[PDB]
């Protein structure tokens, strides 16, 4: 008895099982649709430090997957390469059908070592991990996924009104992270600017900030040196908060731009 939403006159009335309302008309199975809506649209924190907290590892529960016919572009998607600290596999390899989430503005690729208590990784929020029209309850290794929930819809009159046209470019950038103690409270992440330069990661940092940081490091960060890989603590030294608003929020406009000079860098050690 999953709730089946009925769209009438561009208004969403969830259906009533017992009522068998005469009005609603299901002409064909085309009208039936499953929609996978991302969590990022729900106002949840979407940065990898906070997002990892919602994911969790448990064992003794079999993984399940569902198909969602249509999905929403996700600003942030995550690809995990977690391995156990001895190098053992932590996340199950993707089954043949499973493929990466189709449309992602920012792919957060986390490769690192973490305690891996459970056989599989599950979403503590109850949501599904969306993979290319397949919604799973378990994280699969090395496949881009966007955490989301699946909604089932009865589309209106199949008159091309909904999901057939835009009533009214795909460029995906990979933000590569490295993590230790993945899946525990004591987790630390390093944003990987390049092979030799890493930046300590905090929740405040947004993907736009991280890309700007990458540019700033490249232009004037003296990233290349013989000392070794450099881990930099970074703080935007601007009075306003960094990326409080969500991606949709205020169309991300009139947003203060943190010129390269504002960012402050110190070497952790």
């Amino acid at each position, epitope marked *: 008895s999953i709730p089946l939403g009925v769209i009438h006159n561009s208004t969403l009335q969830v259906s009533d099982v017992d009522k068998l309302v005469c009005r609603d008309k299901l002409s064909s199975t085309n009208q039936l649709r499953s929609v996978g809506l991302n969590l990022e649209g729900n106002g949840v924190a979407t940065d990898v430090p906070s997002a990892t907290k919602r994911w969790g590892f448990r064992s003794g529960v079999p993984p399940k997957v569902v198909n969602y016919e249509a999905g929403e572009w996700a600003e942030n998607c995550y690809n995990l390469e977690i391995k156990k*600290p001895d190098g053992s596999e932590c996340l199950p390899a993707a089954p043949d059908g499973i493929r990466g989430f189709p449309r992602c503005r920012y792919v957060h690729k986390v490769s690192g070592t973490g305690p891996c208590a459970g056989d599989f990784a599950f979403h503590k929020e109850g949501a599904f991990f969306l993979y290319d029209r397949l919604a799973s309850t378990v994280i699969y290794r*090395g496949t881009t996924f966007a955490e989301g929930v699946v909604a089932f819809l009865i589309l209106p009159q199949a008159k091309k009104d909904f999901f057939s046209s835009h009533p009214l470019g795909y460029y995906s950038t990979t933000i590569r992270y490295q993590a230790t103690g993945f899946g525990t409270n004591e987790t*630390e992440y390093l944003f990987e600017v390049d092979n030799l330069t890493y930046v300590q990661l905090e929740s405040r940092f947004t993907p736009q900030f991280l890309l700007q940081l990458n540019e700033t490091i490249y232009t004037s960060g003296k990233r290349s040196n013989t*000392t070794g890989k450099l881990i930099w603590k970074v703080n935007p030294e601007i009075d306003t908060t960094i990326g409080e608003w969500a991606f949709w929020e205020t169309k991300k406009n009139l947003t203060r731009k943190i010129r390269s000079e504002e960012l402050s860098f110190t070497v952790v050690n």
Partner: antibody, heavy 116, light 113 residues
Framework: EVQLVESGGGLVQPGGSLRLSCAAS????????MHWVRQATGKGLEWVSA???????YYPGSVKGRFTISRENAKNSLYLQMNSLRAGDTAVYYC????????????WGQGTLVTV | DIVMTQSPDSLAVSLGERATINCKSS????????????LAWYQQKPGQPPKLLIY???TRESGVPDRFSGSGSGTEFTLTITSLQAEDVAVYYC?????????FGGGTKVEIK
């Protein structure tokens, strides 16, 4: 910069126990995953233990139950407790630090030799 | 488990010309997802702890001079010293970090001629 020092090596009677201590400096000990690596005199490097950030312990088959590794973050120290040592265990024991989130050992401590 | 085999047990070669150490893994350590070879090279000078030379099969360590060049893909790998010097004399090791047991190949000793 990064300095790993081994301590506690010595002569142990077969079947006895020894505790090895690795002090660390120049880096944040809590974040990095620490490993113990065994090098026999004539057999080359062998991985003998791993400790994660959260205290999770991983061992190869040889020391699966005999060896218990522990890290105490506050004092920047790594502990390998060797029990029921056998003749095969005699070697130079290194405490190694893998790079953040990867399994290659960037920094190795000055080795300590234990003889059984 | 991947077992690492270094073909030249000892590689006596004169100073200044290329020296190549060959490393063979039982099964390939090239991960499909990132297409990065999970192999590292360690140099152990007599009476010093081993020091990392080349990681990700080809990527070089910051301190290491450009003389140490590493290459290869899939199952087999190699380390090439473009010009050997007296200081380079040491035992060079392999590591595969692609699997559950971290394994080091038997060492290869290079000696000047």
């Amino acid at each position: 910069e990064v300095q790993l020092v081994e301590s506690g090596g010595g002569l142990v009677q077969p079947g006895g126990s020894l505790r090895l201590s690795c002090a660390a400096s120049g880096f944040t000990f809590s974040s990095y995953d620490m490993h113990w690596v065994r090098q026999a005199t004539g057999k080359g490097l062998e991985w003998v233990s791993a400790i994660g950030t959260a205290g999770d312990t991983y061992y190869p088959g040889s020391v699966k139950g005999r060896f218990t590794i522990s890290r105490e973050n506050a004092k920047n120290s790594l502990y390998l407790q060797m029990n029921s040592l056998r003749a095969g265990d005699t070697a130079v024991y290194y405490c190694a630090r893998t790079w953040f989130g990867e399994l290659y050992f960037d920094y190795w401590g000055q080795g300590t030799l234990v003889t059984v | 488990d991947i077992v690492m085999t270094q073909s030249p047990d000892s590689l006596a070669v004169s100073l200044g010309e290329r020296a190549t150490i060959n490393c063979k893994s039982s099964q390939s350590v090239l991960y499909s997802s990132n297409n990065k070879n999970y192999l590292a090279w360690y140099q152990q000078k007599p009476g010093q702890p081993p020091k990392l030379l080349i990681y990700w099969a080809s990527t070089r360590e910051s301190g290491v001079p450009d003389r140490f060049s590493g290459s290869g893909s899939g199952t087999e790998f190699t380390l090439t010293i473009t010009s050997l010097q007296a200081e380079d004399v040491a035992v060079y090791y392999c590591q595969q970090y692609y699997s559950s047991p971290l394994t080091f190949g038997g060492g290869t000793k290079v000696e000047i001629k």
